[PDB]
DNA sequence: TGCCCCCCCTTCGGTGCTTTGCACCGAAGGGGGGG
């Protein structure tokens, strides 16, 4: 086979990111995985004259004990040429989010049968660490299409189309979407019959070389206003501030007639009766918050952003947007683990499910704004990661002024 | 001898040429010591004479090595390093004796002149050129180039370490129950073999190293305990640090105090309770390493406390995989924490301290969380797992924190330990407004151009006040308005601000701050009995807020 | 008059916010220690 010429973006150098510490069980797994890969010639031992590096770690699913090497190519992918500039990119089918159930298959192994541009391999170096720094780090670079590199689905796109089309030929009602190392395969068949054509799909690929999602249960939870039969000054101030915020998102929401219900310097716990002109204002605003906001459309040329808020008792709210206050989706994630003692685990799982939904719906993951300290996240998150991809993220600290999304 | 190992190819950075710097003129007496050094290297083929075609140069010098009769050669490759290609360093960290297991038989070997036994890429050697001036620059002088890794070149440490790893790799796989710690050129070799077969394996390792050109002189071959290793002393059942000697001085300069703090930090890995906050405070706001700083009273006390700790002897122990790791943290005051890591009681593997101020405003629970995170990371590095924790915070306290704090926050499985002072939240904010409590509507504004502002309030009980402020900011006036409302109210208060900046700081329950003003607010919240704190949007005619806003204007 | 690595404490300067200072964070200075 002939390699495809690959370039970084103009004026950019390759990744130079330090390896972070790994536990014993993860180091063992990398060493087993990488030495078998070196024997098969998929990676090559290198030295320090290669100035590039990318962090590596390992993730084990609850369902399958078998470890899975995971390289953080997030930096490399940002500096790699677009394959929409060369038009070798693969589109997303808008018929996936409609499906009854969607299974996710890890097809990363198909990439290991295609060589990578000799001049590009050096950008893929990684380093395995040493318990108690007993030895210096051990370095490899890839010789084939790496798992996690954004260029592998693009280079191997054509090969993927021809392997699948018999299956697509024979099941026109099923939709398959590649996203990096993953296949998202959705159908409308019964819960147990759906699974068997999943296993039929497997062995067609196995011949050459997680769990069921359910999209039509991805309920949108909107902005709600409390209802009591008594209203304190504090209740009306908290409601006026909450709608004054929502007027940046919705249209035609007014506070003039609940505002001067609070005319004067009143005590916070004094019970104020509602004007008729105030129930007029409130019952109306309640249903602008009912159904979604007119005029918000997805734009594939812009990035997706996700904000999450911790709400307590295991619940987490989130919003996905591209322009501020023009949400394409608002939701609430709940924890069914039952441990009820981990906040980082919950957030880590929340980012995977939110990201999964954006893949199914729009075909790419959003950049997350995470409600956690950088160093708390980095102490623990890899303990709970189960996806073969990793989204972009940043860390924010904004207290609630409103509890807008409760 | 020079290793027959393949060289590692190296490049200059793109667009750059080689160094070209005149060697600083030196005396004829040192010049032929120079001459002496290169003549003998030339007989081992470590360097070769060159001439005027090679247009590059770089200057040379030497420093006394602690040997009785040995010297270290060095060449000032500062300029070549700048033009040499970037390297990915393979030394990722420093091995620690608390990470070693008990071994029946132990050896420590060192390779002799490791760098000079590793060859340098042929196409690169011409950039290592150096001149020894002859006849006080009357003649061109002798010129050499390196054929091996020069000391002082940016790439020499990595290429040497990398070369040693490939040479050791066959021997490691051949016999997997021999521990070899490899640090640059220093080899610790442990095993559970009787000292007979051990020494067979040792001689066999030495012969393997020598076929690749790495000598192991008897002088650096340690065969009996206590072993000198990485700055420590290894005993069969325990380990100690080599003696720490702190400066004793009548008058202290900034640079003296800098050395003292570093020594104490180094000691803190095994001596429990070391503190440096008051000594380091003397370095703030200084302007010269030679500036004389008088010790404060608190610094003398802290120094004296550390000196008492250091005159006791102490030891770490080695690691037993068959047992849990336990980490216990104590609180020491002013944002300082100290910890011990052990497996059986009163037998520390190591100790440590955590004392960083992250953020302008924080509290003890956050900082405890940060210490836990530092210890967690250190443990993964040394032992490859995290420990079980013993912490002086009650389950009620922690649970009150991760519910009323809006950021995700978790600490690993731990056990409460009653060792005062305990870590506690110093006040909590009421979730709902307090019946019968006064209601304060606070506001502050400042003019950015004039840096003049006001802070005031109005009240449901009819109270009002306005204070002029000079040389302040927008955010300070808002903090100031909350400051006064807490000052003039009772034990129970309801407060309404329009500054989510102020709400953001205070809702986080800080107990310490780099700001005197925020510190003042903390002291007042701690005195109170109940506080409810409410936000409203500004400039929307909301009863209370608009009254106080008008008053401030 | 040199090189590489880890650690801590201080200081400085860039980023972004529906800002006009502020808080955050990474890099570079100093020190310890290893080779
Ligand atoms: N001040 C120092 C000390 C060490 N090293 C590097 C070069 C050395 O080759 C190597 C190891 O130093 P050693 O103290 O072990 O002594 P040498 O290897 O130089 O000579 P020998 O071991 O034969 O006495 O680390 C350095 O560059 N500068
Ligand atoms: Mg040596």
Short mmCIF file of N, CA and C in Angstrom, two decimals, chain B residues 362-485:
data_model
loop_
_atom_site.label_atom_id
_atom_site.label_comp_id
_atom_site.label_asym_id
_atom_site.label_seq_id
_atom_site.Cartn_x
_atom_site.Cartn_y
_atom_site.Cartn_z
N UNK B 362 -9.61 31.20 50.05
CA UNK B 362 -9.79 29.76 50.21
C UNK B 362 -10.20 29.46 51.66
N UNK B 363 -10.32 28.17 51.98
CA UNK B 363 -10.62 27.75 53.34
C UNK B 363 -9.91 26.43 53.62
N UNK B 364 -9.97 25.99 54.89
CA UNK B 364 -9.24 24.80 55.31
C UNK B 364 -9.67 23.56 54.55
N UNK B 365 -10.96 23.43 54.24
CA UNK B 365 -11.42 22.21 53.60
C UNK B 365 -10.86 22.09 52.20
N UNK B 366 -10.85 23.20 51.45
CA UNK B 366 -10.20 23.20 50.14
C UNK B 366 -8.74 22.80 50.27
N UNK B 367 -8.02 23.43 51.19
CA UNK B 367 -6.60 23.16 51.29
C UNK B 367 -6.35 21.72 51.72
N UNK B 368 -7.17 21.19 52.63
CA UNK B 368 -7.06 19.78 52.97
C UNK B 368 -7.24 18.91 51.73
N UNK B 369 -8.22 19.27 50.89
CA UNK B 369 -8.43 18.55 49.64
C UNK B 369 -7.19 18.61 48.76
N UNK B 370 -6.49 19.75 48.76
CA UNK B 370 -5.30 19.90 47.92
C UNK B 370 -4.15 19.05 48.45
N UNK B 371 -3.94 19.05 49.76
CA UNK B 371 -2.95 18.15 50.37
C UNK B 371 -3.25 16.70 50.01
N UNK B 372 -4.51 16.29 50.13
CA UNK B 372 -4.89 14.93 49.75
C UNK B 372 -4.50 14.67 48.30
N UNK B 373 -4.69 15.66 47.43
CA UNK B 373 -4.37 15.45 46.03
C UNK B 373 -2.87 15.33 45.82
N UNK B 374 -2.08 16.16 46.51
CA UNK B 374 -0.63 16.07 46.39
C UNK B 374 -0.12 14.71 46.86
N UNK B 375 -0.59 14.25 48.02
CA UNK B 375 -0.22 12.94 48.52
C UNK B 375 -0.66 11.83 47.56
N UNK B 376 -1.87 11.94 47.01
CA UNK B 376 -2.33 10.93 46.07
C UNK B 376 -1.37 10.82 44.88
N UNK B 377 -0.95 11.96 44.33
CA UNK B 377 -0.04 11.95 43.19
C UNK B 377 1.33 11.39 43.57
N UNK B 378 1.89 11.88 44.68
CA UNK B 378 3.18 11.35 45.14
C UNK B 378 3.15 9.83 45.31
N UNK B 379 2.02 9.28 45.78
CA UNK B 379 1.94 7.84 46.02
C UNK B 379 1.93 7.05 44.71
N UNK B 380 1.21 7.55 43.71
CA UNK B 380 1.20 6.88 42.42
C UNK B 380 2.61 6.81 41.86
N UNK B 381 3.38 7.89 42.05
CA UNK B 381 4.73 7.96 41.52
C UNK B 381 5.63 6.94 42.21
N UNK B 382 5.57 6.88 43.54
CA UNK B 382 6.52 6.06 44.28
C UNK B 382 6.06 4.60 44.35
N UNK B 383 4.78 4.36 44.63
CA UNK B 383 4.30 3.00 44.84
C UNK B 383 3.31 2.51 43.80
N UNK B 384 2.76 3.40 42.97
CA UNK B 384 1.84 2.96 41.95
C UNK B 384 0.41 2.77 42.40
N UNK B 385 0.06 3.25 43.60
CA UNK B 385 -1.31 3.21 44.08
C UNK B 385 -1.54 4.38 45.04
N UNK B 386 -2.81 4.67 45.32
CA UNK B 386 -3.12 5.69 46.30
C UNK B 386 -3.33 5.07 47.67
N UNK B 387 -3.08 5.81 48.74
CA UNK B 387 -3.24 5.25 50.09
C UNK B 387 -4.65 5.46 50.65
N UNK B 388 -4.93 4.70 51.71
CA UNK B 388 -6.07 5.00 52.57
C UNK B 388 -5.68 6.16 53.48
N UNK B 389 -6.62 7.08 53.71
CA UNK B 389 -6.31 8.32 54.41
C UNK B 389 -6.87 8.33 55.82
N UNK B 390 -6.19 9.07 56.70
CA UNK B 390 -6.65 9.35 58.05
C UNK B 390 -6.61 10.86 58.24
N UNK B 391 -7.78 11.48 58.38
CA UNK B 391 -7.89 12.93 58.31
C UNK B 391 -8.60 13.52 59.52
N UNK B 392 -8.18 14.68 59.97
CA UNK B 392 -8.81 15.34 61.12
C UNK B 392 -9.99 16.22 60.70
N UNK B 393 -10.95 15.62 60.01
CA UNK B 393 -12.19 16.29 59.65
C UNK B 393 -13.33 15.30 59.84
N UNK B 394 -14.41 15.76 60.45
CA UNK B 394 -15.51 14.86 60.74
C UNK B 394 -16.36 14.63 59.50
N UNK B 395 -17.01 13.46 59.44
CA UNK B 395 -17.86 13.15 58.30
C UNK B 395 -18.95 14.19 58.13
N UNK B 396 -19.50 14.69 59.24
CA UNK B 396 -20.50 15.75 59.16
C UNK B 396 -19.94 16.98 58.47
N UNK B 397 -18.71 17.37 58.81
CA UNK B 397 -18.11 18.57 58.22
C UNK B 397 -17.96 18.41 56.72
N UNK B 398 -17.35 17.31 56.29
CA UNK B 398 -17.15 17.11 54.86
C UNK B 398 -18.48 17.07 54.12
N UNK B 399 -19.49 16.38 54.68
CA UNK B 399 -20.78 16.29 54.01
C UNK B 399 -21.45 17.66 53.90
N UNK B 400 -21.33 18.49 54.93
CA UNK B 400 -21.80 19.87 54.83
C UNK B 400 -21.07 20.66 53.75
N UNK B 401 -19.87 20.23 53.35
CA UNK B 401 -19.13 20.96 52.33
C UNK B 401 -19.55 20.55 50.93
N UNK B 402 -19.56 19.25 50.62
CA UNK B 402 -19.86 18.91 49.24
C UNK B 402 -21.34 18.99 48.91
N UNK B 403 -22.19 19.39 49.85
CA UNK B 403 -23.57 19.71 49.49
C UNK B 403 -23.76 21.20 49.23
N UNK B 404 -23.25 22.06 50.10
CA UNK B 404 -23.46 23.49 49.93
C UNK B 404 -22.38 24.17 49.10
N UNK B 405 -21.48 23.40 48.49
CA UNK B 405 -20.50 23.93 47.55
C UNK B 405 -20.85 23.46 46.14
N UNK B 406 -20.77 24.38 45.17
CA UNK B 406 -21.33 24.13 43.84
C UNK B 406 -20.37 23.42 42.89
N UNK B 407 -19.09 23.34 43.20
CA UNK B 407 -18.15 22.60 42.37
C UNK B 407 -18.09 21.15 42.82
N UNK B 408 -17.97 20.25 41.85
CA UNK B 408 -17.73 18.85 42.17
C UNK B 408 -16.47 18.72 43.01
N UNK B 409 -16.55 17.96 44.09
CA UNK B 409 -15.36 17.80 44.96
C UNK B 409 -15.44 16.46 45.67
N UNK B 410 -14.36 15.69 45.62
CA UNK B 410 -14.36 14.36 46.27
C UNK B 410 -12.98 14.09 46.87
N UNK B 411 -12.95 13.33 47.97
CA UNK B 411 -11.68 12.85 48.58
C UNK B 411 -11.83 11.33 48.66
N UNK B 412 -10.75 10.53 48.56
CA UNK B 412 -10.83 9.06 48.59
C UNK B 412 -11.18 8.49 49.98
N UNK B 413 -11.46 7.17 50.04
CA UNK B 413 -11.91 6.52 51.30
C UNK B 413 -10.96 6.88 52.44
N UNK B 414 -11.54 7.41 53.52
CA UNK B 414 -10.75 7.93 54.66
C UNK B 414 -11.45 7.61 55.98
N UNK B 415 -10.70 7.80 57.07
CA UNK B 415 -11.18 7.57 58.42
C UNK B 415 -10.91 8.82 59.25
N UNK B 416 -11.90 9.23 60.04
CA UNK B 416 -11.70 10.37 60.91
C UNK B 416 -10.71 10.02 62.02
N UNK B 417 -9.84 10.97 62.33
CA UNK B 417 -8.84 10.81 63.38
C UNK B 417 -8.87 12.08 64.22
N UNK B 418 -9.00 11.92 65.54
CA UNK B 418 -9.17 13.06 66.44
C UNK B 418 -7.79 13.55 66.87
N UNK B 419 -7.23 14.47 66.09
CA UNK B 419 -5.95 15.11 66.38
C UNK B 419 -6.10 16.61 66.19
N UNK B 420 -6.55 17.33 67.22
CA UNK B 420 -6.78 18.76 67.06
C UNK B 420 -5.51 19.47 66.69
N UNK B 421 -5.60 20.63 66.01
CA UNK B 421 -6.87 21.27 65.62
C UNK B 421 -7.58 20.54 64.49
N UNK B 422 -8.90 20.40 64.58
CA UNK B 422 -9.65 19.77 63.51
C UNK B 422 -9.93 20.78 62.40
N UNK B 423 -10.15 20.24 61.20
CA UNK B 423 -10.57 21.05 60.06
C UNK B 423 -12.09 21.20 60.13
N UNK B 424 -12.56 22.45 60.09
CA UNK B 424 -13.99 22.72 60.22
C UNK B 424 -14.40 23.90 59.33
N UNK B 425 -15.63 23.85 58.84
CA UNK B 425 -16.23 25.06 58.28
C UNK B 425 -16.46 26.08 59.39
N UNK B 426 -16.03 27.31 59.16
CA UNK B 426 -16.03 28.34 60.18
C UNK B 426 -17.32 29.14 60.23
N UNK B 427 -18.25 28.86 59.33
CA UNK B 427 -19.59 29.42 59.32
C UNK B 427 -20.30 28.80 58.13
N UNK B 428 -21.62 28.78 58.20
CA UNK B 428 -22.44 28.34 57.10
C UNK B 428 -23.47 29.42 56.80
N UNK B 429 -23.86 29.52 55.55
CA UNK B 429 -24.90 30.45 55.16
C UNK B 429 -26.26 29.75 55.19
N UNK B 430 -27.26 30.46 55.71
CA UNK B 430 -28.61 29.91 55.78
C UNK B 430 -29.16 29.70 54.37
N UNK B 431 -29.89 28.59 54.21
CA UNK B 431 -30.46 28.27 52.91
C UNK B 431 -31.70 29.11 52.63
N UNK B 432 -32.38 29.55 53.69
CA UNK B 432 -33.60 30.34 53.63
C UNK B 432 -33.47 31.56 54.53
N UNK B 433 -34.18 32.64 54.21
CA UNK B 433 -34.11 33.85 55.05
C UNK B 433 -34.63 33.59 56.47
N UNK B 434 -34.14 34.38 57.42
CA UNK B 434 -34.38 34.15 58.84
C UNK B 434 -35.53 35.03 59.31
N UNK B 435 -36.55 34.41 59.91
CA UNK B 435 -37.69 35.16 60.41
C UNK B 435 -37.26 36.01 61.60
N UNK B 436 -37.78 37.23 61.67
CA UNK B 436 -37.44 38.13 62.74
C UNK B 436 -36.10 38.81 62.62
N UNK B 437 -35.30 38.46 61.62
CA UNK B 437 -34.02 39.11 61.42
C UNK B 437 -34.18 40.35 60.55
N UNK B 438 -33.38 41.37 60.86
CA UNK B 438 -33.32 42.58 60.05
C UNK B 438 -32.88 42.27 58.61
N UNK B 439 -33.41 43.04 57.66
CA UNK B 439 -33.08 42.87 56.24
C UNK B 439 -32.30 44.09 55.74
N UNK B 440 -31.08 43.86 55.29
CA UNK B 440 -30.20 44.92 54.81
C UNK B 440 -30.11 44.86 53.30
N UNK B 441 -30.35 45.99 52.64
CA UNK B 441 -30.14 46.14 51.21
C UNK B 441 -28.86 46.93 50.99
N UNK B 442 -27.82 46.26 50.57
CA UNK B 442 -26.49 46.84 50.50
C UNK B 442 -26.18 47.23 49.07
N UNK B 443 -25.30 48.22 48.93
CA UNK B 443 -24.82 48.62 47.62
C UNK B 443 -23.56 49.46 47.81
N UNK B 444 -22.64 49.32 46.85
CA UNK B 444 -21.49 50.20 46.76
C UNK B 444 -21.16 50.55 45.33
N UNK B 445 -20.75 51.79 45.07
CA UNK B 445 -20.32 52.20 43.74
C UNK B 445 -19.04 53.02 43.84
N UNK B 446 -18.27 52.99 42.75
CA UNK B 446 -17.02 53.71 42.65
C UNK B 446 -16.93 54.35 41.28
N UNK B 447 -16.21 55.47 41.20
CA UNK B 447 -15.94 56.13 39.90
C UNK B 447 -14.53 55.70 39.49
N UNK B 448 -14.39 54.97 38.38
CA UNK B 448 -13.05 54.45 37.97
C UNK B 448 -12.09 55.62 37.71
N UNK B 449 -12.57 56.68 37.07
CA UNK B 449 -11.72 57.86 36.75
C UNK B 449 -11.23 58.56 38.02
N UNK B 450 -12.09 58.69 39.04
CA UNK B 450 -11.72 59.43 40.28
C UNK B 450 -11.24 58.49 41.40
N UNK B 451 -11.57 57.20 41.32
CA UNK B 451 -11.17 56.19 42.34
C UNK B 451 -11.75 56.58 43.71
N UNK B 452 -12.95 57.16 43.69
CA UNK B 452 -13.69 57.62 44.89
C UNK B 452 -15.03 56.88 44.87
N UNK B 453 -15.45 56.34 46.01
CA UNK B 453 -16.73 55.62 46.01
C UNK B 453 -17.46 55.76 47.32
N UNK B 454 -18.61 55.10 47.41
CA UNK B 454 -19.44 55.09 48.60
C UNK B 454 -19.94 53.68 48.82
N UNK B 455 -20.20 53.33 50.08
CA UNK B 455 -20.88 52.09 50.40
C UNK B 455 -21.95 52.39 51.44
N UNK B 456 -23.12 51.79 51.28
CA UNK B 456 -24.20 52.03 52.22
C UNK B 456 -25.24 50.93 52.23
N UNK B 457 -26.32 51.18 52.98
CA UNK B 457 -27.43 50.24 53.05
C UNK B 457 -28.72 50.97 53.41
N UNK B 458 -29.83 50.26 53.26
CA UNK B 458 -31.11 50.62 53.88
C UNK B 458 -31.73 49.35 54.43
N UNK B 459 -32.77 49.51 55.25
CA UNK B 459 -33.23 48.42 56.09
C UNK B 459 -34.75 48.38 56.20
N UNK B 460 -35.29 47.17 56.39
CA UNK B 460 -36.73 46.98 56.62
C UNK B 460 -37.18 47.53 57.99
N UNK B 461 -36.22 47.58 58.91
CA UNK B 461 -36.41 48.19 60.26
C UNK B 461 -36.16 49.70 60.15
N UNK B 462 -35.92 50.20 58.93
CA UNK B 462 -35.73 51.64 58.65
C UNK B 462 -34.31 52.18 58.79
N UNK B 463 -33.31 51.34 59.05
CA UNK B 463 -31.91 51.83 59.20
C UNK B 463 -31.30 52.24 57.85
N UNK B 464 -30.43 53.26 57.85
CA UNK B 464 -29.75 53.77 56.63
C UNK B 464 -28.33 54.25 56.98
N UNK B 465 -27.40 54.25 56.02
CA UNK B 465 -25.99 54.70 56.24
C UNK B 465 -25.23 54.81 54.91
N UNK B 466 -24.27 55.74 54.82
CA UNK B 466 -23.44 55.92 53.63
C UNK B 466 -22.06 56.36 54.08
N UNK B 467 -21.04 55.64 53.63
CA UNK B 467 -19.66 55.94 53.99
C UNK B 467 -18.90 56.35 52.74
N UNK B 468 -18.16 57.45 52.77
CA UNK B 468 -17.30 57.81 51.64
C UNK B 468 -16.05 56.93 51.61
N UNK B 469 -15.63 56.59 50.40
CA UNK B 469 -14.45 55.76 50.19
C UNK B 469 -13.51 56.45 49.23
N UNK B 470 -12.21 56.45 49.56
CA UNK B 470 -11.19 57.08 48.69
C UNK B 470 -10.19 56.02 48.19
N UNK B 471 -9.67 56.20 46.97
CA UNK B 471 -8.67 55.27 46.37
C UNK B 471 -9.19 53.83 46.37
N UNK B 472 -10.46 53.63 45.99
CA UNK B 472 -11.04 52.26 45.96
C UNK B 472 -11.44 51.88 44.53
N UNK B 473 -12.01 50.69 44.36
CA UNK B 473 -12.48 50.18 43.08
C UNK B 473 -13.96 49.84 43.17
N UNK B 474 -14.53 49.46 42.03
CA UNK B 474 -15.91 49.00 41.99
C UNK B 474 -16.12 47.80 42.91
N UNK B 475 -15.29 46.78 42.76
CA UNK B 475 -15.48 45.55 43.52
C UNK B 475 -15.24 45.77 45.00
N UNK B 476 -14.35 46.70 45.36
CA UNK B 476 -14.09 46.93 46.78
C UNK B 476 -15.27 47.59 47.47
N UNK B 477 -15.92 48.54 46.80
CA UNK B 477 -17.07 49.19 47.41
C UNK B 477 -18.17 48.18 47.70
N UNK B 478 -18.34 47.19 46.83
CA UNK B 478 -19.39 46.21 47.07
C UNK B 478 -19.05 45.36 48.28
N UNK B 479 -17.80 44.88 48.35
CA UNK B 479 -17.33 44.21 49.56
C UNK B 479 -17.48 45.13 50.77
N UNK B 480 -17.21 46.42 50.60
CA UNK B 480 -17.33 47.35 51.72
C UNK B 480 -18.77 47.47 52.19
N UNK B 481 -19.73 47.46 51.26
CA UNK B 481 -21.13 47.56 51.67
C UNK B 481 -21.53 46.36 52.51
N UNK B 482 -21.08 45.16 52.13
CA UNK B 482 -21.35 43.98 52.95
C UNK B 482 -20.62 44.09 54.28
N UNK B 483 -19.43 44.70 54.28
CA UNK B 483 -18.67 44.86 55.51
C UNK B 483 -19.45 45.67 56.54
N UNK B 484 -20.10 46.76 56.10
CA UNK B 484 -20.81 47.61 57.05
C UNK B 484 -22.08 46.95 57.56
N UNK B 485 -22.82 46.29 56.67
CA UNK B 485 -24.06 45.65 57.09
C UNK B 485 -23.79 44.61 58.17
#
